[PDB]
Amino acid sequence: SRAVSAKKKAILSAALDTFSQFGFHGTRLEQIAELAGVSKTNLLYYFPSKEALYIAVLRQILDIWLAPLKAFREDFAPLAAIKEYIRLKLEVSRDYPQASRLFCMEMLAGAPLLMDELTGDLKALIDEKSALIAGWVKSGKLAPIDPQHLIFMIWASTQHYADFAPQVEAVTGATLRDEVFFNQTVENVQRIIIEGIRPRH
Amino acid sequence: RSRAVSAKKKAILSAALDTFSQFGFHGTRLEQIAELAGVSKTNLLYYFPSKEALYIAVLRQILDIWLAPLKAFREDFAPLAAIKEYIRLKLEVSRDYPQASRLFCMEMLAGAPLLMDELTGDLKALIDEKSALIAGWVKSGKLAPIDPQHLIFMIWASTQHYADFAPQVEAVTGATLRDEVFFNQTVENVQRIIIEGIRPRH
Ligand SMILES: O=c1cc[nH]c(=O)[nH]1
Numbered sequence A: 001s002r003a004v005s006a007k008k009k010a011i012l013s014a015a016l017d018t019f020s021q022f023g024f025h026g027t028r029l030e031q032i033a034e035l036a037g038v039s040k041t042n043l044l045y046y047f048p049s050k051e052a053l054y055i056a057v058l059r060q061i062l063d064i065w066l067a068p069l070k071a072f073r074e075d076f077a078p079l080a081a082i083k084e085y086i087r088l089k090l091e092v093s094r095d096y097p098q099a100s101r102l103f104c105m106e107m108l109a110g111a112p113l114l115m116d117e118l119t120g121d122l123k124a125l126i127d128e129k130s131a132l133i134a135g136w137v138k139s140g141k142l143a144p145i146d147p148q149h150l151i152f153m154i155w156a157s158t159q160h161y162a163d164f165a166p167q168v169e170a171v172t173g174a175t176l177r178d179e180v181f182f183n184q185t186v187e188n189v190q191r192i193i194i195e196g197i198r199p200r201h
Numbered sequence B: 001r002s003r004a005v006s007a008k009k010k011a012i013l014s015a016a017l018d019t020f021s022q023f024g025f026h027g028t029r030l031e032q033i034a035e036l037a038g039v040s041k042t043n044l045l046y047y048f049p050s051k052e053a054l055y056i057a058v059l060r061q062i063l064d065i066w067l068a069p070l071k072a073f074r075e076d077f078a079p080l081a082a083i084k085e086y087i088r089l090k091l092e093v094s095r096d097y098p099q100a101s102r103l104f105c106m107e108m109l110a111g112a113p114l115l116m117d118e119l120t121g122d123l124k125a126l127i128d129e130k131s132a133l134i135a136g137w138v139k140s141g142k143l144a145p146i147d148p149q150h151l152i153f154m155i156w157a158s159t160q161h162y163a164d165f166a167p168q169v170e171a172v173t174g175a176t177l178r179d180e181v182f183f184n185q186t187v188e189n190v191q192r193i194i195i196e197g198i199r200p201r202h
């Protein structure tokens, strides 16, 4: 149904903005229900608790973050695939900083509510894609870097510009919404990581 | 300068770090910091006039630890060797002081309400100075053409990740930086990507 999806997205977006501004414990479901334009009973049909909504919000940003990596295939040009991956991750930092910070804040608390996804569906995908990239490496299409550590570096360097945005602005005077700085950021992150994993000699 | 006094101020700062780490800034009471440091409230207020002053002192101390290697950069150093220590020291700090990494990251997530003066002032000054130093290394052919500030941010981001995102690292790999073998694999992998990413080539 389109209507169910339209409504689930209105709730998730209202939920993101409310968790972002009031934190998990200070947020009440009725407040989210007011801003999505729906009744509490209607909201609870799709998300039975504050915990369910919160987890769903973080699953949504994870699905966005991982889409490029889920699309990886063995016959891709490895360096080209990874440079596109880096570019998509920084567009997410520019456009969805609130969700990036919400995820980072969950990690800082020990991932009390997200540990089910990290040990389950997330670990399954990274195991699968790590084996794929290890194939690219055991075949000389990439230098020898270990796959899980290359992935962590991609995540860390692109999410930095959202999560650490106040420090980036303080040192450079710019943000990712400044077109020129955005393009300089993409090119420089790409240069270091790509040349760092490019086959040699 | 008196060391006993310095030893006492560091004892207080360390009690503050772990109390701020466990209860957050607004939930922390000065009485808790004093009781856990082994000192009277009055002795704490002698050195730190407010909870906000102490909190800022705690975050400045972790900044000083983090930036010491970069302050030590000088034009005549071997660039790649210097950046290899920097990465190694940053990963040692993520292993030994994860609580401080998390507290600083949490300050950034709130918009840096209390620390923004330190970022726009002393931090920006150092990064300007050392970024020009690194631009000199590139204009003298000792490094590939990279932009200095983004190289620095990547050193920070990739090394602090293993502390701030430790639960995700453990979930995906089963390990932490306290495992000697995983620590050494991490150093070698981060160093390899950044160093080979910036090596002159030619
Ligand atoms: O892109 C991603 C995906 C999963 N976890 C992260 O921290 N970043």
Ligand SMILES: O=c1cc[nH]c(=O)[nH]1
Residues within 6 Å of the ligand: A164, A167, B063, B066, B067, B156, B160
């Ligand atoms: O090492 C450092 C120094 C300043 N700010 C950071 O995030 N990391």
